Amino acid sequence: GCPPCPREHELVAVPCEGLNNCWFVEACPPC
Numbered sequence: 001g002c003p004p005c006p007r008e009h010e011l012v013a014v015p016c017e018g019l020n021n022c023w024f025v026e027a028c029p030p031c
Contacts, residue, residue, distance in 0.1 A: 002028030 002024035009016070009025050016022040 002026065004028070005031040007031065 005028055006025055007030050009023075009030075011022065011025075014021050014023075016025055
């Protein structure tokens, strides 16, 4: 799952805001 509230994760290989893209920033939105 996702760790405590993140800040910025470099999703360079696979961009976030997608379907089965975000590794661990989806359920845990950056503060």
